[PDB]
Ligand binder design. Sequence first.
Ligand SMILES: *[C@@H]1O[C@H](CO)[C@@H](O[C@@H]2O[C@H](CO)[C@@H](O[C@@H]3O[C@H](CO)[C@@H](O)[C@H](O)[C@@H]3O)[C@H](O)[C@H]2NC(C)=O)[C@H](O)[C@H]1NC(C)=O
Ligand SMILES: *[C@@H]1O[C@H](CO)[C@@H](O[C@@H]2O[C@H](CO)[C@@H](O[C@@H]3O[C@H](CO)[C@@H](O)[C@H](O)[C@@H]3O)[C@H](O)[C@H]2NC(C)=O)[C@H](O)[C@H]1NC(C)=O
Lengths: 362, 362
Amino acid sequence: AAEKGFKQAFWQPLCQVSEELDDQPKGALFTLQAAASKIQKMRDAALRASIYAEINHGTNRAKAAVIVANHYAMKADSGLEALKQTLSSQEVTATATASYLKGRIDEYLNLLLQTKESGTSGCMMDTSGTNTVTKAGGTIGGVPCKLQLSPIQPKRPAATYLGKAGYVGLTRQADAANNFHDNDAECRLASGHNTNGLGKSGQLSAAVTMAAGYVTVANSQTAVTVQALDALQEASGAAHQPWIDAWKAKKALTGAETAEFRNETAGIAGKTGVTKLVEEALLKKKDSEASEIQTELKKYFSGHENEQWTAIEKLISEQPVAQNLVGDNQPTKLGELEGNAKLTTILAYYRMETAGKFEVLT
Amino acid sequence: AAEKGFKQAFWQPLCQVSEELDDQPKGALFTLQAAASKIQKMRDAALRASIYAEINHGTNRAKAAVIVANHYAMKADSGLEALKQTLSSQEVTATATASYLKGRIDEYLNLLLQTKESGTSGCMMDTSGTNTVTKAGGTIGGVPCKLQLSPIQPKRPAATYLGKAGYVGLTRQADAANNFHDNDAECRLASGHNTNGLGKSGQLSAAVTMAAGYVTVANSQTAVTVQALDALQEASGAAHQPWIDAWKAKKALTGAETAEFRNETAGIAGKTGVTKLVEEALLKKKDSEASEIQTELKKYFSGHENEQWTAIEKLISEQPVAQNLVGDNQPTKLGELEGNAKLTTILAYYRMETAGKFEVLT
Ligand SMILES: *[C@@H]1O[C@H](CO)[C@@H](O[C@@H]2O[C@H](CO)[C@@H](O[C@@H]3O[C@H](CO)[C@@H](O)[C@H](O)[C@@H]3O)[C@H](O)[C@H]2NC(C)=O)[C@H](O)[C@H]1NC(C)=O
Ligand SMILES: *[C@@H]1O[C@H](CO)[C@@H](O[C@@H]2O[C@H](CO)[C@@H](O[C@@H]3O[C@H](CO)[C@@H](O)[C@H](O)[C@@H]3O)[C@H](O)[C@H]2NC(C)=O)[C@H](O)[C@H]1NC(C)=O
């Protein structure tokens, strides 16, 4: 009936979205950290290749290790520039839009949860619309609904409730009078009329919209209107803009999964850096033919397809640094040493060794 | 009087906090980007030093430039690890806590803004408590209150309404009956009693708290109670935990201003990397007394205080590159070249030259 407490078929959907939005910061955390860890891994690969080039100068595989090292430096570099330029705003924008909307929902839902008179007359009713609900654990009567933001630790959010299309549970309502509103449980929050709703001496001046422009409450003796948020299109100035915004933001996310954070397993001449380095340094001739790139590569790699890039990488990994550099009975092989700070210093030990030579050498 | 619409004294404070908490994402953005830009600048300095050590390999000036280059690599490296480990969660946590609380406030304030009957009876009143206020632009009658989250673009923001100790304007209220509540404007949201408040056939079951546990609304014919939020202590399970949380998070922020993102202008032996590199590579005597560190440094730097570190740095920034390595009419000096990707390339050209000179020589 109109101007009556809300039955679970109204509020369970909003609970689901609130609890799903709760994971958006956790996701943002996960991604921002994933981007640095990946930048770090590319850096580590370039450090390992550089150190091999320093130890093994004179050989051709040393020149190969420089091309490997420059590619991974460039990866590690474009990763940090992607983090700055794209990923930071994206995850901040997702975290903020989702949290602001979660706040809006939660305030409304906790109003309803609190405006009750008896255990059978109130604003928040069970499915049956026989009793009011009570929070127990992080559920409002069994339904998982904490109505507060959980502590942010990294993890991937689900997209069940907010998908690529909009809010799936916030479909159109055909019969709000019956499916949302109880037959008799009283709620003044259910209308804007002075009799069984929010008006005191009169109906209010106009319709009130609640939950960030989700539900409209009229000053007339009528039932609620809810927006269908399941098939959204981007808009501005929309009454339920918060909903649009959290959707649009979540929808724009790529994660630390773009090109820059992914390794390339194609042919050597195609890898980030190779052809342009071969033209500039080795060939000293710009805009050359793919064959003459292929040729130079065969000198260092023994070919030009991914299996020779790995073979060099294997040499780089098997390559051991001095025990004087890494501890006691500790792992000395480069493939077994990780950590930018650690590897940056092993590199400076060998950059120092290379200076020593060239002062006796020239 | 009790069970009456709220006068500007009550709501202007919440407007101020909502609007301040609007800048928290903008700040988070600003910092996350500031951290990458600073990591980038340290990297650029290590790239410039490395290239000088390459272009001049085998000298003591190249040996000095290696120590400079390893310090800046280590900075750039610990910056990305600080970004990952500390700054990411910090700014995500600040953005989410603030946005969730801004959502909670805004929903309450927009309820009040909407529950009005006449232009003189309602829930949101002016200071005089004579008229109901209205939202024009991003202001509800003069006082700035957009009641929505602004688009996130970078900004450094000075906290005035939320600061180190809590929410400044959310003071203990001595006389809510008079300073908050009007004499006669009607608001059902002002109590939980069935006569002029939210109860329908009866008072509600208990007190309702609103704005994330800020204001308590009793089922009795009484005036509102508001929490003093201006001298907070961290707590758990608190009725107004959102407030505590946004405070604690904002209070924990350091910004991209920690050690790792700041340059060190102390003596050379004290700089990040120098003594440990001198012991490991040059001295090959791990655990050497600072005088013998001072000595080695004099060989490269011509001393051991900050003015010699800069002099090397001057040489480094002076050092020109090959004309072909730069754009049509672009500068060739290292001090005049910025951009990790750009400099990573110049470094690989010279790493290749060193490769070729070492074999041309050996
Ligand atoms: C992009 O691809 C490169 C090449 O695979 C990655 O570098 C490699 O990273 C792994 C660790 O992730 C290192 O593996 C080592 O293998 C040895 C032998 O199997 C094992 O004993 C060690 O425990 C370790 O697993 C490998 O040495 C290293 N290779 C090079 C050339 O540095 C890089 O991490 C990838 N980047 C990203 C963002 O994933
Ligand atoms: C930490 O300190 C180092 C050393 O000051 C910074 O590197 C230096 O960065 C500046 C640009 O920020 C470069 O300055 C150049 O100066 C010349 C001559 O005055 C001028 O013509 C150029 O337009 C440019 O301003 C300088 O070359 C560079 N020095 C080195 C050795 O790389 C570094 O940026 C600081 N780090 C952070 C995070 O601020």
